[PDB]
Structure formats: C-alpha cells, structure tokens
C-alpha cells in the first residue's frame, strides 16, 4: 500500500477514525464526517463517485461556505511528492539514474487521480452550480486564477477545457426527429386571439399548450431554489423565483377552471364546461402531465365546485370514471401517483408539491451534525437524502415534449389572470357565492338562468385528427 504525505504537511492524510468519519452499514457510503474527510472522499484516489460529487455540490452550502470550499479543494490539489528512497539514493550516489519506483507509483496512483478528481469537482461546480459564481464575482476570479495557473502536462487538457467552459458560462436545440402532431383548431381560428376561451379552443390543443407551458416551468426549477427550504423563507421571491412562477401558474389554472364553472350560470352550459374540463384532464393523463391532472382535480374538489350536485348528476358516466381515476392518484398520500410516475415513459410533468414537502421534512427532521466521541461531524446522510430528491427532480427535467408551440395559445395561457385585481380571499368568497347563487342550498329551489354562450357547446372530442 502507498505511503502518504505526513498529516502535518498535508491535512487529507489523517487516518480514518470514528472521530472524523462514519460509514453507513462496491464503495463505502458516508453517514457523517468532518469537512476535511468529506472533501478527501469527494476526491478519493481509489475510486470515482460522480453521484457523490452531485450530492456534495448540491448541498454543501449548509455546512461550508463557497469561498471555504474552494480553499479546501485547492489545498487538496497541492500534494507533496515523496523524497527519493534508499535505493534511489544509492543509484544517485553512483552516478546512475534512479528507478524512482515509489515516486512514479505515487504520482500515477495518488496524485494524478486526486488532482483529476479535484478538477472534476471544479468542472461540475462551474457547469452545474454556476450560481455560486454569479452571486460572488471574487469567487469566480479565484476559480479562474486557480485553474489558469495549474501547470503540468498531465492535467493540461482539462485545465484548458475548464478555462474555456468558464468563459462560455460567463457570457451565457432539440432533435426528435419524428415530427410533432398537427396543431388542432376548433371554434377559434388561428390569429383570432380575441375569441380564445375554454370552449372555443380545441380541448386537445388546450391540454398540449398547457403541457408545454407547465413542462417549461417544471424544467426551469434549479436545486438552488430548493436546498435549505428557501422557498418557504422570507427571501423566497429572491431565492426561488422559478419554483414560485411554476406554482402560481398551477394555482391560476385551477382558479380559472373554478371560475369558468361557477360563472356559467345555466345548468346545461355549465355541464358542457365541466365535461370539457374532464376531456382536458384526459389529454393531460395521456401526456403524463401530472401537474395538469392535479390542477383539474383540485378544481373539482374545491368548495365552490364540489357542492354542485345538479351539475354532477348530468356528467356522463364515462367522464365520472375518468375524474375518479385521476382523483384516486392522490389518495393515501399519493400512493398511486407515485407508482404511476415511476412506471410511465417520459416526457412527463411531475407534481412538484410532494418533492417540496419531502425536502422540507428531510431538512427539519434531521440534525445538521452528529456528536461522536466529543466531536461534531457533519451529518451527510441528511444531505444525501435531500440530493436524492433533487436528483429525481432533475431526472424528469431532461426529456422534452415532441409538441409544437402555438404562440398565441401560449400567450393566452401565460396571461391568464382569473383573480383580476382582487385579493385571494375576496376572489375566493366571490366564487363560493357564485356557487351558492347557481345551486342554492337545500331546501331553496333550483333557479333557472339564461344561456351565455352563442356558439355550439358540442365538444370536438379528444381524439386527434390527421389530414395528409
């Protein structure tokens, strides 16, 4: 086994012990450790662990500042070479070239792997966690300086590469190649944005364009918006703007559905509205847009809508079944949803809410440190659990939908604003009062209301068409 530098000149050569590292019960899994040990294992000479690199880079800010991390990995990089051995000494004393076997082995099996793995940490840091550098320009200067002054031809290719990657990142296309289906139109025709509405757009195309929108919003959320539970804290608008944009879209669409329903006072017309929404739900299911599915289900379980007995009575049985199956996804703490998400063929749009709750509870329910033998060790298993969740999120963010954007329909749903200028409670009370108006509580008699739509209510259905 290779001898190491003295732990006095090189801190990362301390022997493992339960005072500085604890392993979980073919590479070891770390339960806890000092920062020094975490970084040693992050850049271990015996093996790579690219998943450890992602986990560490995603979660380290809870136990180490970015500036300090950079200092520590630079320290890790600077490994002292051993002195010539007795055999080397003898060779030199006789004017011969030493074999330097121990030196050569140490270079090949310790220094070069550790240094490359340090560079791999830098590369991942810059490529996938560049926000540290966006938020701290001096940090970036330090990284550029470190990388730009690494000498030696063994590291040269990656040094030159990482230098270019950083420069690209500072100033910062899909193949399918099967074509997306034809955009479908109903009563509203292309370019006639003024007529766009729930019943006038094609229900297929409503579901497609909302899915593209919701997929884009889902794909835009970075782990930086999630770690430390920052979307729940006072600075959430600063730290989690993409997550909040995504959630506010979902909320707005649910409210829009409720509004469309209760502002349609005529029972027959309202039935057509609900049927159309369940058809959109069906296309959401076909597209694996689970955010969309729950958007609809949440609307149907809302107080204003849920109580509409007369409307429910007239929904066709086959649509009741569709709505019921969608609802059952959320039953028993999303048991069937979780199973379904793990079984489908992506692309999909997950429901983000479950991830948020699991990240928050993991963070609040586990200690930052473990106390062992008088020492405080970083509880890394807690961080690994968080990174498992962010990792799953990222896995579903890779696959793009093969659907064509319709710019006007996209804009229509981007600009949807059912609450108008009203505050939430005001709007919420309004919807419930509308509900009470259109279907009064027993024993008040059911009134009649005039029709509001001048166009046909008959749905074109949700099976796609294909002319030549």
């Amino acid at each position: 086994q290779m001898r190491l530098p003295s732990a006095d000149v090189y801190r990362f050569a301390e022997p493992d012990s339960e005072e500085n590292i604890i392993f979980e019960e073919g590479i070891p899994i770390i339960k806890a450790g000092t920062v020094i040990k975490l970084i040693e294992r992050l850049t271990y000479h015996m093996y790579a662990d690219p998943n450890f690199v992602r986990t560490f880079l995603t979660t380290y800010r809870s136990f180490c500042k970015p500036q300090e991390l950079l200092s520590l990995i630079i320290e890790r990089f600077e490994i002292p070479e051993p002195e010539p051995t007795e055999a080397d000494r003898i060779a030199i004393e006789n004017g011969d070239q030493p074999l330097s076997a121990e030196l050569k082995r140490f270079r090949k099996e310790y220094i070069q792997p550790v240094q490359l793995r340090v560079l791999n940490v830098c590369r991942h840091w810059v490529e996938h966690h560049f926000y540290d550098f966006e938020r701290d320009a001096y940090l970036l200067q330090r990284m550029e300086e470190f990388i730009g002054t690494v000498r030696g031809k063994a590291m040269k290719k990656w040094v030159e590469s990482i230098t270019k990657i950083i420069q690209r990142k500072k100033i910062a296309n899909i193949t399918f190649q099967s074509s997306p289906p034809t955009v479908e139109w109903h009563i509203s025709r292309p370019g006639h944005i003024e007529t766009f509405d729930l019943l006038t757009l094609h229900p297929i195309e409503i579901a497609r364009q909302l899915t593209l929108l919701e997929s884009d919003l889902y794909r835009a959320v970075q782990p930086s918006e999630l770690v430390g539970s920052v979307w729940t804290k006072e600075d959430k608008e600063i730290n989690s703007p993409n997550l909040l944009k995504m959630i506010r879209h979902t909320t707005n669409l649910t409210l829009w559905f409720e509004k469309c329903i209760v502002e349609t006072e005529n029972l027959e017309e309202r039935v057509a509205v609900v049927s159309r929404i369940i058809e959109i739900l069906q296309v959401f299911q076909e597209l694996n847009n689970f955010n969309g599915v729950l958007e609809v289900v949440s609307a149907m379980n809302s107080s204003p809508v849920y109580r509409l007995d007369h409307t429910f009575e007239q929904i066709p049985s086959r649509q009741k079944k569709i709505l019921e199956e969608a609802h059952e996804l959320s039953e028993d703490h999303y048991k069937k949803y979780l199973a379904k998400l793990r079984s489908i063929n992506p692309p999909c749009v997950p429901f983000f809410g479950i991830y948020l709750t699991n990240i928050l509870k993991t963070e609040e329910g586990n200690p930052e440190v473990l106390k062992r033998h008088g020492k405080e060790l970083i509880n890394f298993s807690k961080r690994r659990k968080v990174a498992e969740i962010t990792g799953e999120i990222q896995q579903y963010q890779n696959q793009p939908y093969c659907l064509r954007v319709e710019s006007d329909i996209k804009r229509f749903f981007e600009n949807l604003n059912p609450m108008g200028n009203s505050m939430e409670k005001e709007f919420t009370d309004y919807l419930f009062n509308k509900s009470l108006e259109i279907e009064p509580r027993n024993p008040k008699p059911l009134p009649r209301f005039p029709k509001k739509y001048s166009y046909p209510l008959k749905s074109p259905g949700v099976r796609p068409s294909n002319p030549r």
Partner: protein, 167 residues
C-alpha cells in the same frame, strides 16, 4: 379493526409547522426522519385506554399551492390549526383557515384544535392569553408546543382525537 382518524395539519408556512408531526411520528429517542417512507405519517396510539390509528396529513412546504387547500382539507375529520408564537401574521391567519375548514366540511362544528408552536428562541410575539381568548371565542382547545423538546406534541394530537370522539 381499530378506529382510524384522518387528521389534517394546517397553518402558515416558513415557521416550523412541520416539527409538530415529525416529533409525534418520530420517537425523540432518535433525531431522524425519512418522510419518503409510508409509516412516516401513520401511528398507532393508545388514547384514554382505547387503541387507535392516526393518519396525519401535513403538506408543509406546499403553502403556495393555495388552490389545493380545499382538496387537502376535504380528506380530514379533525384539524390542527398551527401558528408560530413568534409570528403574529401566522396567528392572524388562523381565522381564515378555520373559516375555510368550515366551508370545506360544510359544518359549523368541525373537530379542531388551536396550536401555538414555539419554533426557536426568537422573541415571542403572541402571548398565550391572546391565543386562549381566540380559542375560547371559537369553542376549541388551545395547546402550546415546542418544536425542539417535544413538549405539548402528544397533548395536541390526543386532544384533537378527543374532540373527534366527543363530537
């Protein structure tokens, strides 16, 4: 077999709400939690001699999904309305949560408890007298809990189960 109670935790985000259920379902003999596993929100308990099963829904972290609140609340037969004693706004939110629960359950008499949660050492801003008066005005119990020591946690959940049983 044994009765199962569907309990729902509601209240403002960002102020330690989740500690209540975590501390219950945990064991406070090991500081540990995996919310990912089923039985992280199910717990068999004995209350006044009668064994029952508690199913707790705590959607902490999903507060911004405000249009899902009805759907989540609809699933429950008893409610813990949680505020943080160092956050007056969360206390002022309680009224609307109670109104929303009443509407969703279509009843003026829904089993619920008011819970004042102490989530850190920041200064208290809601005095217990204020919270007691509010709870009395609603005709419901008030329990204060610590997010750190597990104090009051069993009392909060058991009291709610008693409200359900005596409904």
């Amino acid at each position: 077999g044994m009765t199962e109670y569907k309990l729902v935790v509601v209240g403002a985000g960002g102020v330690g709400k989740s500690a209540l259920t975590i501390q219950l379902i945990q064991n406070h003999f090991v500081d540990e939690y995996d919310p990912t596993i089923e039985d992280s929100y199910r717990k068999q308990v004995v209350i006044d001699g009668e064994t029952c099963l508690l199913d707790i829904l705590d959607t902490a972290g999903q507060e911004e999904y405000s249009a899902m609140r009805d759907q989540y609340m609809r699933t429950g037969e008893g409610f813990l309305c949680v505020f943080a004693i160092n956050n007056t706004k969360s206390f002022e939110d309680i009224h609307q949560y109670r109104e929303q629960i009443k509407r969703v359950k279509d009843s003026d008499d829904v089993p619920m408890v008011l819970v004042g949660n102490k989530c850190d050492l920041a200064a208290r801003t809601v005095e217990s007298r204020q919270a007691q008066d509010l709870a009395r005005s609603y005709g419901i119990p008030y329990i204060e809990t610590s997010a750190k020591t597990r104090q009051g946690v069993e009392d909060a959940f058991y009291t709610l189960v008693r409200e359900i049983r005596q409904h």
